[PDB]
Structure 1
Amino acid sequence: MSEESQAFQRQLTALIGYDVTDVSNVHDDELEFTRRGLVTPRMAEVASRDPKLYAMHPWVTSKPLPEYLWKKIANNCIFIVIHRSTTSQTIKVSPDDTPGAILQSFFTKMAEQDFVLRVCGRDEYLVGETPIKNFQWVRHCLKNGEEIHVVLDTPPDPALDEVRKEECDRKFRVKIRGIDIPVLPTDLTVFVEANIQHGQQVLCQRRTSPKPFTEEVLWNVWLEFSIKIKDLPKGALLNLQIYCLLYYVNLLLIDHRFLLRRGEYVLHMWQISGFNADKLTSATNPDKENSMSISILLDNYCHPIARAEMPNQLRKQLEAIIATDPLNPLTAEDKELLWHFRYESLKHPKAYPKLFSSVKWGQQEIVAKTYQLLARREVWDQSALDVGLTMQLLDCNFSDENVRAIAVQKLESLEDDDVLHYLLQLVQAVKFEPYHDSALARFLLKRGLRNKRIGHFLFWFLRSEIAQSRHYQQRFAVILEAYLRGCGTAMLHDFTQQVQVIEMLQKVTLDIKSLSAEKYDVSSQVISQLKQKLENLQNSQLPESFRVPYDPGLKAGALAIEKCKVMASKKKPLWLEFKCADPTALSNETIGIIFKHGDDLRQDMLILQILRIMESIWETESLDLCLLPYGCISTGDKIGMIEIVKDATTIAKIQQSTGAFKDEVLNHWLKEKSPTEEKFQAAVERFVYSCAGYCVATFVLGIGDRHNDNIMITETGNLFHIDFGHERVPFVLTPDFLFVMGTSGKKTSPHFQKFQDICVKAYLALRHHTNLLIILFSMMLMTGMPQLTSKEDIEYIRDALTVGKNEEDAKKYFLDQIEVCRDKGWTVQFNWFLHLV
């Protein structure tokens, strides 16, 4: 291995945030096996991709243009302004015209074809055989009444993407020798609980006798289970837990080579913090100095893995079972029906999760029958892709490789635009995989390597978890390395630049962070001190430019140091502004970015992403709620970036121009921020729509009860919530908001009626996607929050979506929710100030 390759691994290590060649916290080679296993998948995808399309990464969709967007196009013509260079002309185009076609109706229309259209000031390209109405940037401009400005330039050199060349029928038993902890900080008793699990299902449980809890407790006792070795399903975990529940650790009973685990193990455990994905991890606690450890012995030898049509009425019970929601509990009777009528079940794709949860994973013969069932998968293969259904099969309830692989099989047909909508959830679902190398992990690798925008985001989503998840950083580091090794030198160089910038901002944040206090900073001393620290960086080691992490198409240049500062909040985040490093930009507007240290931004990324998914759902129903999910990216441990939405203030700040509350303050602000009455009327309309979206969206997620200071509005009428990092009211619809809609005091009016109608329409559009939302919500709680109870926490969403009711009871239910808010007025808002004292 050339000394060159070592310098390179060192580079990857710094991009990753973890050293994948570190073998301090392993007890086998699953991780190395996986690094070698992912070489093939990576190389195959690198060799399959088109160098040109990969270089320009056009962002496209197959979805039809929504009704509400055709409205802005009734002349069947679209005007593209080509600016190359210092000259320019506006060209009318047809929604079906291809970029190369409008280049034909150009070149000849004026009068060398080695050119391409690029969005001004962005690294965004309009290329490939696709109708222009099918480009996201084109739709983004229409939704915002913006003009489409493009520049004619030379295609990027694919050379810049060069990839560096690479080079027994016995019963199961386990002996628990003992446990050891360095320091015990009332003497309690302690015992060990051993479980055999599969898909969060205890097939067998054994306990040791209780013993005095001392720094070292020994048993030397065999725990014999009823399950036979031959019966162990692949992917089963031996879950070991210490009760006084204090600590846990897991060990895959069958390894990545299909071999039964054997030998001595000394496992360092995870301590419970006073149900979640972290509990299923096969990784051990990296902290060997201060953790509990448990020693065991496994002696097990083997090398395993070597015309009844339904009566009319049972069929009704079956269909009833199938229609229930993902959270409905399956009775023993239900499972027996699903299983007995296996072949009937296999004809309803929606039954797949319920049915596979009816399998006795602890019986070799049954698992075998299950694979037989899966063999004739015709119905499933021809079913229309149902994301909600595919995801149910990737959660904690399914440990079977084959069952999860057919889920992944359906994802294979998603277009890039959809992978982007679900990427973050798919990356989180890698946590439910029992092995490091898996079909889902390979799918993320492959889609990332096929596309620059997916790879860019895939990078940050993996780095965010690697930096702050001890339970999964090892598996995610291997996935990230595999991707880094095939994205190409150009991307590699881009990531390096982003990492240096954020690494420098930590240092600045941290040095600044020492001079400070809680609730009020001031310190004209520290701000003068900030500008100096930035000035020092500005010359270098801070790169000329870098891609904005949450808006990769944007290149930030030099800092506009005079506009930078430290924000006045509990945490002392930086408010940075940069010049755009693209001269072709269509403006002089700086790029604002809030960089913050001290908080885990992953809950906010997660929330924002679900908001983006709710928007896409509404799009499929021809609705636009005008939500505003601003960029947010967790970039490292307790640190990350946030987009500064331009021309925006806090709804509280507006009121503060304390504690009393006036209804017209908001309308006055908006009327005053409007250049014309026309713009003011548009702002009023836009507020109504955005207000409705946040009311529906926020209620469903059960994050509707917010303080005025966590809600903002743009001068253009766009309302939007912020800071999602973790009497009552379902959501916020205060008197001032009502006033803008022309109502007050249990009144009504055309905009207000328009509000209720949109809300209702928005609400029921989400109910047609009830299962998708439920599975995203529960996956979110398991993989993003603390130890959340499945039974009660996850059930909230079921009640909110009012599962079990028809449309009429639904409309009524939401309308009442709007009424509760009305009755409450300013009550709730006003009450928070006192909680502080």
Structure 2
Amino acid sequence: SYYHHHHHHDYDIPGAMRPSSGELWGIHLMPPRILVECLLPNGMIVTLECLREATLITIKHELFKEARKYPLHQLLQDESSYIFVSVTQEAEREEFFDETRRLCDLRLFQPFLKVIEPVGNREEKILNREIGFAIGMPVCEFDMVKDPEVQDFRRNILNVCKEAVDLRDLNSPHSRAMYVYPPNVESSPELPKHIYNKLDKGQIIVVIWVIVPNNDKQKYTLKINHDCVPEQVIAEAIRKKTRSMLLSSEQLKLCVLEYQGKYILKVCGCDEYFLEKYPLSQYKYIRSCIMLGRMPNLMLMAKESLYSQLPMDCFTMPSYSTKSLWVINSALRIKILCATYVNVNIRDIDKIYVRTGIYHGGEPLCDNVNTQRVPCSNPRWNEWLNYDIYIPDLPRAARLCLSICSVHCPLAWGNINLFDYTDTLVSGKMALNLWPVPHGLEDLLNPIGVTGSNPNKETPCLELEFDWFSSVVKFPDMSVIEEHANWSVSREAGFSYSHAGLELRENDKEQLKAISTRDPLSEITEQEKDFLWSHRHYCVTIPEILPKLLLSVKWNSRDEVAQMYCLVKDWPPIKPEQAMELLDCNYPDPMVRGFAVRCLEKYLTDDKLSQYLIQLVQVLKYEQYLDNLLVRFLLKKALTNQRIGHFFFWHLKSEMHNKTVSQRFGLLLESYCRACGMYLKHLNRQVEAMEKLINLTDILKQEKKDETQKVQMKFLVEQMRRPDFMDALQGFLSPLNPAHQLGNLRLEECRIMSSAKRPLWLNWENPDIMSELLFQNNEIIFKNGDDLRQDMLTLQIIRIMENIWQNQGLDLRMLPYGCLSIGDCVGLIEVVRNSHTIMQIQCKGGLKFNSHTLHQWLKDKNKGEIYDAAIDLFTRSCAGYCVATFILGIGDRHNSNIMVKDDGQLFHIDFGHFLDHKKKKRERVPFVLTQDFLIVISKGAQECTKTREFERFQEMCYKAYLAIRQHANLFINLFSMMLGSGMPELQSFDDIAYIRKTLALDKTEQEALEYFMKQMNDAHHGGW
């Protein structure tokens, strides 16, 4: 009667409710006592018992005592004459020079150690282990790479390394300290008005601290102008220290002059310094204190004790240092031969063929197939395919895309560049190993997918013959493309009158600027393309139209493409925000991307770079070759500035697991680590810390599952106290922010959370001199299971919406906490102290849960006139978080993913799928302000719909939403650049199209405003 008695026979009673191998092959963490086969020079195998944690000095010394009890001891030298060696898990044979290292940290395969006399006697040069540890793959694995492009990248890219090292020691020690400790500084020295008003007539109280014995410290409260520089602030604090009943006025002036330049300003509690003449306000720390109603606490640090701290980078140069295409008078043809390794079931599948096409992002000719020959087993075609386009019409960035399909459905895919890194048109036979069908891609062929054969051997290997033409066919030089443009110009001037479908006009002159404004994802029509392409000379008037123009150009007509190359040549530089579109997958031409990197060199500030650095590293995936202008740009900026370098390293080191980029990023990381100076040692200490934490949580998750929290937690604390964990997890820099140092582990504040990912709550001592002034404890979460990079990105997108709103005079407060993905579903999350899930607030207030409990809880923290401003904080944050949330379309918000702070700020966490991923299998509103919230907005009131507080709040929502709608070009493009990462929520442009509807860009701003309210009104049921 429940089930109409329908059985399920299939159902049996006994997914519901990785991994990186550990310290030894096949086991996560070596046993506390292990036996180690020691191969001696004399041929004797002597097995020693060792402690997991024992150093190689400890081991060697003990070995050479035990070696006396064995035969042939007289053959052996002193212990000091030898170094250890063994086969590691990456499968190379490391020579273990640093004998302070311990047995568990060696990444050995099997537990044996061979003894030898050290060869390659320049031992200096075999601290490439350092470089390989940081990168996570050995440098000898690049050495034996056959491909010339790689080897030519490796040697060529040192141009950059050298040039950037030379800027570092241009004013040493000042430039060196400016590299290592660069000034963390806002975009403009111009101030927002809501910030200014918090100044009582352009003035900050500041506190300059000093140390003199060392134990005792001394405040000096200056009240100075916000726009004054650090050198001024430093003088003022010296005046105050040294004024006395024994120094005349003039005596003081002569005491400041000797003193004024022996000091610099440090932030109390972290390694930030004020080394550059900027307004104090233009440093982020100051501008942070003003907003939070805090008193900047600086420190006078003498420069000799700062340059005493600094190193010497000492960069060493490594050991590793026709026919014009337009002559070829034929149409393109490519021979499909045979796939070898196709996994096809004969029982469902009819027939299989190789679909093909040439591409430029979008298509340049009739995409074809071949005949449905030898389907399923035995699969083999022998056809030249014939493509309607001439060999000279092929543009520099042309690419063959193919796929083996079913009947309609893809099985595999792979893409090749039709020219090589040296412009040579592809001839011969190629063996293309294929990539597998992704999630969101249902379409046949996949041209957004990466160029290159799969390094993975056991995959569909489709081979093919390319056409030969009596020579290496090379793409024409720029001088020759120029001349041909200059001819296409003078030629077209003489063409005669009656002519279809190609001075000016006033009606038209505005309609181009009409097009210029439309977002990337507003598709342009053939008429418009023609219309643009004909006025292309007037289009330089509006350099912002360029993306529309480039997409309008016919890339299959070399006459056009030579003309367009020549416009670009001296096109006027444009804004980074818009130029960034020119590095996404739709603009693959090198002259184009060249022009975009030339905009960044002029315009993009080291500040704005690091904001968009994620997007720029992703956009490397869409370059055709390894050596290209963007790579050299970023490589330079990273070696110019160690804050960028840090995140530049990690964003690469994150993706190294991913075989689409392991080569390219691997090679790039090598260059970085070879040039970045002493930061390589700092990165290796982070890299070593993160590994332990991975191996530790990897055990908690496999085997130690099914043991009470208590049991795991005792096993954790047992592990963390081991000397190697102590070594590895204590004196280092937080990767979320290298400014913050991490000292001793407070293991009693350190625990495993409730979650089934077994995320670690970790807590370090902030070992700064003035820790007290900023925070005595730095705590951050390490999370093994989840994929951080959706969150990482949504967090970024928020940070930018904030900066947009605030630099445009309106103060909604977002709290984009730190999130760093350091690997394949591994990462770090910043802990916001003094914050609780609404659901804790409801549990801890629950009488043996009333809608007021939140509001009650909040009053109970914020009493007096404090309360009034603390509601303003909640009202301001909650508005911003409404609009952002709506615009992005993040996961449904609820009581255990919403968080409020003691001071009354609210913010979201664990955002989940960002562009409305789950729901699309609509225009949802994910932040539904329940009664709980509306009560808090309306200090006492019932009927919260009706108050002014809600009208106020509504106004904040409307002003924010339109503010983002004017910078939507950016938000589209930021997401467009993120297509590179295989985030399922961003597989294709139509995924990004959600952000159009929700921002309502096809409508007019007034309609948009109403749509937002319409959307807000039905979700809430009344008010707007």
TM-score (norm 1): 0.92
Is contact 1:78–1:92 with CA below 8 Å preserved after alignment? yes
- Identical-pair percentage: 38
Correspondence for 2:780: 593
Deviates more, 1:201-210 or 1:64-73: 201-210
Correspondence for 2:234: 103
Provide the secondary structure at the position in 1 that maps to 2:1016.
Answer: helix
Deviations 1:66-113 (A, max 9, x none): 111112212432222122222221112212221112222232343343
Partners of 1:812 and 1:183 lie apart in 2 by 53
User: 1:283 aligned to 2:452?
Assistant: yes
Is contact 1:235–1:435 with CA below 8 Å preserved after alignment? no
* Cα offset, 1:429, TM superposition: 1.5
User: 1:221 aligned to 2:346?
Assistant: no
Provide the secondary structure at the position in 2 that maps to 1:58.
Answer: coil
Provide the secondary structure at the position in 2 that maps to 1:756.
Answer: helix
When residues 724 and 215 of structure 1 are mapped into structure 2, their CA distance, relative to the original with a 3 A threshold, is farther
Deviations 1:268-292 (A, max 9, x none): 1110134889943123323213x11
User: 1:271 aligned to 2:396?
Assistant: no
Deviations 1:411-440 (A, max 9, x none): 222222211211111111112222222222
Is contact 2:619–2:980 with CA below 8 Å preserved after alignment? no
User: 1:208 aligned to 2:370?
Assistant: yes
Is contact 2:619–2:978 with CA below 8 Å preserved after alignment? no
Partners of 1:650 and 1:493 lie apart in 2 by 39
Partners of 1:61 and 1:224 lie apart in 2 by 57
Is contact 1:13–1:19 with CA below 8 Å preserved after alignment? yes
Provide the secondary structure at the position in 2 that maps to 1:267.
Answer: strand
User: 1:174 aligned to 2:334?
Assistant: yes
* Map 1:217-256 → 2, pairs under 5 A: 217-244=379-406, 245-256=410-421
* Cα offset, 1:407, TM superposition: 1.4
When residues 266 and 313 of structure 1 are mapped into structure 2, their CA distance, relative to the original with a 3 A threshold, is same
Is contact 2:403–2:414 with CA below 8 Å preserved after alignment? yes
Correspondent of 1:312 among 501, 506, 512? 506
Is contact 2:353–2:373 with CA below 8 Å preserved after alignment? yes
Is contact 1:177–1:297 with CA below 8 Å preserved after alignment? yes
Partners of 1:516 and 1:745 lie apart in 2 by 53
Partners of 1:749 and 1:479 lie apart in 2 by 58
User: 1:434 aligned to 2:434?
Assistant: no
Deviations 1:117-138 (A, max 9, x none): 1111201001222111111111
When residues 553 and 173 of structure 1 are mapped into structure 2, their CA distance, relative to the original with a 3 A threshold, is same
* Larger relative contact order (Cα-Cα within 8 Å, sequence gap ≥ 6): 1
Letter in 2 for 1:668: Q
Correspondent of 1:541 among 727, 730, 734? 727
Correspondent of 1:55 among 175, 180, 188? 180
* Cα offset, 1:550, TM superposition: 1.3
Partners of 2:314 and 2:375 lie apart in 1 by 56
Partners of 2:989 and 2:725 lie apart in 1 by 55
Structure 1 residue runs of 4 or more that deviate by more than 6 Å after TM superposition: 24-27, 275-278
Deviations 1:708-766 (A, max 9, x none): 32221212211111113439534231211111011554633233222111111111111
Partners of 2:698 and 2:193 lie apart in 1 by 50
Is contact 1:281–1:472 with CA below 8 Å preserved after alignment? no
Correspondent of 1:299 among 467, 472, 476? 467
Correspondence for 1:812: 1010
Partners of 1:143 and 1:2 lie apart in 2 by 58
Deviates more, 1:531-540 or 1:64-73: 531-540
Partners of 2:140 and 2:550 lie apart in 1 by 38
Partners of 1:25 and 1:143 lie apart in 2 by 56
Is contact 1:667–1:736 with CA below 8 Å preserved after alignment? yes
Deviations 1:664-685 (A, max 9, x none): 12101212233x3333333211
User: 1:84 aligned to 2:210?
Assistant: yes
* Map 1:371-410 → 2, pairs under 5 A: 371-377=565-571, 380-381=572-573, 383=574, 385=575, 387-410=576-599
Partners of 2:206 and 2:772 lie apart in 1 by 14
User: 1:31 aligned to 2:31?
Assistant: no
Deviates more, 1:559-568 or 1:223-232: 223-232
Is contact 2:720–2:726 with CA below 8 Å preserved after alignment? no
* Cα offset, 1:62, TM superposition: 4.5
* Cα offset, 1:183, TM superposition: 5.0
Is contact 2:928–2:1019 with CA below 8 Å preserved after alignment? yes
Deviations 1:244-286 (A, max 9, x none): 1121111111111111122222121110134889943123323
Letter in 1 for 2:673: L
Partners of 2:370 and 2:605 lie apart in 1 by 52
Letter in 1 for 2:717: K
* Map 1:319-718 → 2, pairs under 5 A: 319-377=513-571, 380-381=572-573, 383=574, 385=575, 387-412=576-601, 413-467=603-657, 469-489=658-678, 491-517=679-705, 522-537=708-723, 540-542=726-728, 544-587=730-773, 589-657=776-844, 662-674=850-862, 676-703=863-890, 705-718=892-905
Partners of 1:44 and 1:488 lie apart in 2 by 14
Correspondence for 1:260: 425
Is contact 2:364–2:555 with CA below 8 Å preserved after alignment? no
* Cα offset, 1:517, TM superposition: 4.6
Is contact 2:791–2:912 with CA below 8 Å preserved after alignment? yes
Is contact 1:59–1:135 with CA below 8 Å preserved after alignment? yes
Is contact 1:240–1:249 with CA below 8 Å preserved after alignment? yes
Deviations 1:550-603 (A, max 9, x none): 122100111110111111123111111111122321256321111011222111
Deviates more, 1:57-66 or 1:417-426: 57-66
Provide the secondary structure at the position in 1 that maps to 2:722.
Answer: helix
* Cα offset, 1:139, TM superposition: 0.7
Correspondence for 2:262: 114
Correspondent of 1:7 among 121, 126, 132? 126
Letter in 1 for 2:186: T
* Cα offset, 1:641, TM superposition: 0.6
Deviations 1:660-705 (A, max 9, x none): 964212101212233x333333321111111111111111111163
Partners of 1:183 and 1:267 lie apart in 2 by 16
Provide the secondary structure at the position in 1 that maps to 2:389.
Answer: strand
Correspondent of 1:759 among 957, 961, 976? 957
When residues 791 and 442 of structure 1 are mapped into structure 2, their CA distance, relative to the original with a 3 A threshold, is closer
Letter in 2 for 1:80: V
Computed over aligned residues only, the root mean square deviation of the Cα atoms, in angstroms, reads 2.7
When residues 35 and 500 of structure 1 are mapped into structure 2, their CA distance, relative to the original with a 3 A threshold, is same
When residues 117 and 376 of structure 1 are mapped into structure 2, their CA distance, relative to the original with a 3 A threshold, is closer
When residues 317 and 99 of structure 1 are mapped into structure 2, their CA distance, relative to the original with a 3 A threshold, is closer
Max Rg structure: 2
Partners of 2:557 and 2:453 lie apart in 1 by 29
Deviations 1:523-574 (A, max 9, x none): 3111111111111157643154111111221001111101111111231111
Letter in 2 for 1:410: C
Correspondence for 2:932: 736
Partners of 2:465 and 2:139 lie apart in 1 by 28
Provide the secondary structure at the position in 2 that maps to 1:626.
Answer: coil
Q: Give the paired residue count.
A: 814
TM-score (norm 2): 0.76
When residues 229 and 103 of structure 1 are mapped into structure 2, their CA distance, relative to the original with a 3 A threshold, is same
Deviations 1:452-504 (A, max 9, x none): 1111111111111223x221222222222222222111x11111111111101
Is contact 1:781–1:794 with CA below 8 Å preserved after alignment? no
Is contact 1:175–1:296 with CA below 8 Å preserved after alignment? yes
Partners of 2:226 and 2:513 lie apart in 1 by 44
Is contact 1:561–1:577 with CA below 8 Å preserved after alignment? yes
Q: Which runs of 5+ in 2 are unaligned?
A: 1-119, 169-174, 212-216, 243-258, 319-327, 478-492, 498-502, 914-921
Partners of 1:598 and 1:62 lie apart in 2 by 36
